[PDB]
Amino acid sequence: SAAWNDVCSGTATYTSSGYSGGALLLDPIDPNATITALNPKQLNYGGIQAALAGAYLQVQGPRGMVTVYVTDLYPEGADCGLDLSPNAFAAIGDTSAGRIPIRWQVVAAPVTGNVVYRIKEGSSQYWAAIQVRNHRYPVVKFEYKKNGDWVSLPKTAYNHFVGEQMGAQLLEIRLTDIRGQVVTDTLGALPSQGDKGVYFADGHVQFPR
Amino acid sequence: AWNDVCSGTATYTSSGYSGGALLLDPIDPNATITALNPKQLNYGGIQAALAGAYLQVQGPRGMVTVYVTDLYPEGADCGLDLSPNAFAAIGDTSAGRIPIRWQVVAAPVTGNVVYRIKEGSSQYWAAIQVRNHRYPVVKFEYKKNGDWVSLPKTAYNHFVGEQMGAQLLEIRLTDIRGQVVTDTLGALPSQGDKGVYFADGHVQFPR
Amino acid sequence: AWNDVCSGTATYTSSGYSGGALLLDPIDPNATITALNPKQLNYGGIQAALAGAYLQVQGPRGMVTVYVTDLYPEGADCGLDLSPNAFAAIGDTSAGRIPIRWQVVAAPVTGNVVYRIKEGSSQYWAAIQVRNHRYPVVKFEYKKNGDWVSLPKTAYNHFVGEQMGAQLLEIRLTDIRGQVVTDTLGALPSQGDKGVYFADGHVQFPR
Amino acid sequence: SAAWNDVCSGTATYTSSGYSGGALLLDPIDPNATITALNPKQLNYGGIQAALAGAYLQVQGPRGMVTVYVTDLYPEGADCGLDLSPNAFAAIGDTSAGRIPIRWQVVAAPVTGNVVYRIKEGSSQYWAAIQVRNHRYPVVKFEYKKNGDWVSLPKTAYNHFVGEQMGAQLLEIRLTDIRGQVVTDTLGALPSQGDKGVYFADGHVQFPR
Amino acid sequence: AWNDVCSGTATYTSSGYSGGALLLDPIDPNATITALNPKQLNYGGIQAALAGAYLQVQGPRGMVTVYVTDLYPEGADCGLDLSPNAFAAIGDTSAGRIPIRWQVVAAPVTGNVVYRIKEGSSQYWAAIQVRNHRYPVVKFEYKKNGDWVSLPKTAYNHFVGEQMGAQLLEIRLTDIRGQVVTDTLGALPSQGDKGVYFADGHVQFPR
Amino acid sequence: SAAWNDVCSGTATYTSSGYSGGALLLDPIDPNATITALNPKQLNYGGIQAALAGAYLQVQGPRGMVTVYVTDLYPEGADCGLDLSPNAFAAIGDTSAGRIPIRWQVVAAPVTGNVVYRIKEGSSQYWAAIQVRNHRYPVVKFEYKKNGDWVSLPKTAYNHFVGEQMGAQLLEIRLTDIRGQVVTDTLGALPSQGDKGVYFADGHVQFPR
Amino acid sequence: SAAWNDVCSGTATYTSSGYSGGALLLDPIDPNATITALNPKQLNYGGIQAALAGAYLQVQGPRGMVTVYVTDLYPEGADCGLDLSPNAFAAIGDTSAGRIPIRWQVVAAPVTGNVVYRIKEGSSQYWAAIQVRNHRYPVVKFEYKKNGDWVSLPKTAYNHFVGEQMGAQLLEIRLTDIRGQVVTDTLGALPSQGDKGVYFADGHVQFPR
Amino acid sequence: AWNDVCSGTATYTSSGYSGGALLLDPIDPNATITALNPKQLNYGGIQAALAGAYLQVQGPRGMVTVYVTDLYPEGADCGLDLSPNAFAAIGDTSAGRIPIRWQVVAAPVTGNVVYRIKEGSSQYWAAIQVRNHRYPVVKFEYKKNGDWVSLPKTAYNHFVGEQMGAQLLEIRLTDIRGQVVTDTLGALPSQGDKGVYFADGHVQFPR
Ligand SMILES: O=C(O)c1cc([N+](=O)[O-])cc([N+](=O)[O-])c1O
Ligand SMILES: O=C(O)c1cc([N+](=O)[O-])cc([N+](=O)[O-])c1O
Ligand SMILES: O=C(O)c1cc([N+](=O)[O-])cc([N+](=O)[O-])c1O
């Protein structure tokens, strides 16, 4: 009954985009997964770009309920609007209704194991973009330790947190989910120059239940 | 006269929980909120002076505390445009308009102030909002080569500063009581193409 | 995904046996090899993700399995630039371009993985290549102070890490199926003035 | 007869704060100790943050004298002002006066044994915060040896000395107290990454009487 | 004209021992000190040129040496604003104003100069003060990327430099006689959030 | 025999001013030096204010010859007129004549070492005034490098070159003397705000002989 | 076929200039090489200054065909005009004619190896000019990476690409030739101040055949 | 066009054996040396490109080979400023100015190249001169994180690099003929507070 889990009422359409090349850089998507694009107003919760990227939403339509994984931006979607994948749309409605009424809310993701960090290509001690994947709840704040004090990083529309002059040593980092739960983790040192491509690092924590 | 008791009238409206002018979103759906008329909101010529204040509003049937999130444009002196839950606690909702006597009180905050950095903020142009403050914030200063540079507060409840630079910032806050606290804030982006982000402060105005 | 069939076309060239971008020399002259288009080779954004994979390629006239040793730069989606012997087994070389389907398969390896240490590698900066792997390697980790550091993979099919140290390395490899093995590797040179050298691993990705 | 032991004329208040969580990170404090918070002008003597942290001050009030241990900052305290603890206040004045006139000076601490080093959590060869504790006189200068030369470290308001790129080897340090008395010592190597908590190392020297 | 005999008048004040403009605290309560008129203090347009000088002042009753710790703002040419102990040494205190002849002389220093790094100093902006110097310092250079750089002296008796870096620096001092010495100085903070700290130098101006 | 070293015929007076507080801001002056004030027509050669500031003029009178350092403007001076120091006057003529006939020309100065830069109080990356001192020959053009190209700065009556928007980086500068000889130098970055006093920098070049 | 390889019909003269001091700063030039100056209209193709600088042009004349290297601007040249070196002119026409009809097109350069970077004197992290040399085809776009996105730099009449505030770290750069072919490369840090002369770096790519 | 015959004139001077701008001291007092005009010294816009070259110089009376130690700043095209012993060997000395024809030639070196590390060099900023080279050195590279980085040559005949680090360096040298040699060079000082020092190379440009 809080702000983060408030129930949205809107309409859904269906689309086959979002399994590949979504704006949120969450590939690879299981081709059998039920997914959705999210309208700007909710995706950018509180003005935080991509705040609900990778969230799981429970969606109720006229005739069923499904859980979907936010992988794309839905650029022209109205308030509370979803652009559902076809299997998710069919599980809650009739494809020949074109557009259906929906109600939805953020819910806990079916994650096992800890969060996963994706370091964007070209990241370095000078400029880096760090994405958090496999999180039980949407991630709204990313902090790291520098000279003994925490430094908050902004989230981008491509669902990474960007930081400048982060240095080239072991990063002590701190994450906050949309409920305000805080976890702390460590991450290996960034590349010294930005001549590298994507790589993934396992994290050592997971937001609680 | 910050502690002065206002006398006026209250209407109600279901706006303010989102998209209000003071950019205080997200508002707790449980919160009792209000829009504030221009004369008290822009106290002393300073835009959004009372933004994020807590007003103790006494009405016919009771007394409630509300959270200023919006401007009440056509509101008269001492006028409030309350949320439905706050209006119903202090008056009969049948009325549509009720007499009220209110005064600024201390927000029941836990923890320290929070800094909200507006999208597009940079070393060249930045807007910084202070939320979670015990009392309303009327002066925002940062330290440049030894002096405190005072920044104008805007109608959208951020302080705006130009050419603030890309280093660690030392800031000074003054609330409507004249209480002063000093804090640090991480460096702003070197270019202004980022969205909103939040950072915890390390101080709170005293009781 | 990564295991599904690919549909595309194959050209052919005599490059790749020597000096391919994936630094997999020495190549057996009897080998059937291919260069791989950028989209599939750099799967998931990971440079040279499919380096050293085996592709089962079906063509008009037959089926052949090939070893990814190079990048087909102008290559199109699902494009392969095949070696002649492999092109001629699955189609008419007279045609210059042929329709193909292909997918990743287990390599016909015997024995463990092999490590190749790039010239100039050292405790301060090192580049380490895994070859003779049953499936493609997408993640290379090493234990520092008791925790696993992930190293980025480069376009020249090595994993590059800084400040790795001059101690015995515990490492951990993840293939594209998500299978994990754990291995040891002798200490890196104290300074980066050494050439290429090779060391055998003690593990192979499960069948 | 010198600047360091000049006599301050001021006024005192009392407070029950400072036995725990004081700004100078001097816990644990004996609950029966006579302690004080110190106004910023004398606490930050010569502009050195926390210069008089851990000092002992002899305080003369209207009815007696008492020795207090400086554990916190009196943020709004006026010139020469002290925020005493209630036992120190009753030792020298009547609580019902609220505010009492005092005169105080720095005096020798009743220490037994050598100085003690406290290493802040998150210290490393890259960035480190080292506190000096159990010192006979206030410590105003912290130097360590690097490549043949001494290197001076600034003191902070949380009563630690802070250094960058200090290295992960055994440390030769040099301390100056507020009288100009000099001792030198060794400190075990700092952790190589900033992933450890607080710990305490015994020193081997003490400033003379 | 550095050893030139100045003829003026002296008054007395009890400021100077703390909070003087030249930031020379802490002052030995036993010291005889003076504030210096702007004409001789800001010699040649160089702010605080004679800061920390020792002036040998002759009066009607006797002669005393004073330590320049402050600016005598309304001071006249050759004017001094003495401390009560130095005025009493050389005049009848009941007289409020005495005629004086003085000149700069060598300070009775012991050991080498001392560097006082101002709060806020960093690789981006630093103020460095030289004290315990036999003669007044009028030029501060440091070596940057292989070249010497002259730093302006300020009214608060520090030399100021920007973008100086966060590494050991070679420096070069020139006293008012033209005597040059060279020294080293430790790394400035990488962030400008520290207080004052002191570092010993390794040279003194010759006799 | 060119335009810059053309022989001037005029009259000299003598004055005791210009050893201190001259308009060309060249203090300190050796009180033993032989100095002069220069009439506006030759001081502002080419219309370049202070073109001949700090020149050395060789001056022949009825009785001798002397070399003088131009330290001030002779405001009421007529064509080719000088207002000499008394020791320069007495070296070439009788002070009781009051006014003497002279013939003079610019000559190389007895510089030792390289040129010297004086930065005027209030200079900054936005507005700056830079004086060239200790030059073998008068300086008629001051250029600095911005964005790949030289930028000529006008000279003022107070013997500095003034530039707007010079920026706060290392300055590459180019100097021309009245003979057309060019030299190239470097100068440390200007203050970022005009809040500093005078200060001097050594140059690394001198005009050739 | 396309606009980049359209056949120009024009006239050619001969000049002995262009082997050194040409406006496009391509020295050193082999003295046996067949070179040309190129009229403004095709040299500044699409308005891009020096677009065809360092192009190779196949020139058919009345008498034969030759390939030429574009080293200079032909200021007064008409539409499709070339100012040929004497060996090139004599290879395709008779010199006594003084002016010959020519047809020509951009062709691939006899390039051995990868491209070559020439960094102009005075370049730095604040202002830098970078010339591409030894390119198989004319180079019409130059981009480098800053804060994670590409920044396009304008070409100059002196055949360098110029950028401001490029910084002093490793440069990831992207080159586009006149056919639209894109290669990616890296380049070492620019100097921190603009006090350096010309230096050269080899690239690691070439435009495809 | 670099080894072409230059036709110009020579003067003579007693400078260049000490304090020459190419920092080639100590110069053998028996050596025949020359200052070189800016046009040929700075070939291709590379500062000091021909520093330490040997020029065979033909004049009216004979021939001599000279060692380029200095910049001849006023020198005209192909201009040389010879030392007295070199001028006297090829000209009448009373002439003051003589016609000359000259070309770069191989230096009669013995042994490998020598490296000279400028005072103040460090891992942060370093200046490295190459001495004892058969032909002029026009490009200097060092390996950093696996790749070559080119350093600009300066008017004082050193290559300057920033952030080169404090570890063993792999370096690559290119002479003006296009010949390439590879070498190693001991770690630079971790702080720039040292004087000049020399280290032997292990390679020499081919004949
Ligand atoms: O600190 C945060 O991460 C934070 C995040 C949001 N948010 O994600 O909407 C809002 C507030 N806030 O204070 O209203 C925050 O403090
Ligand atoms: O084990 C080796 O000694 C070894 C040697 C070479 N080699 O000498 O080229 C190549 C490989 N390899 O696995 O390609 C090796 O394993
Ligand atoms: O060396 C120091 O630690 C030091 C400390 C102070 N201080 O704590 O006021 C003053 C000076 N000083 O030179 O005036 C110092 O040299």
Ligand SMILES: O=C(O)c1cc([N+](=O)[O-])cc([N+](=O)[O-])c1O
């Ligand atoms: O290697 C050396 O120790 C050495 C020393 C000097 N030096 O002591 O003047 C000069 C050269 N040199 O090559 O000109 C050297 O090689």
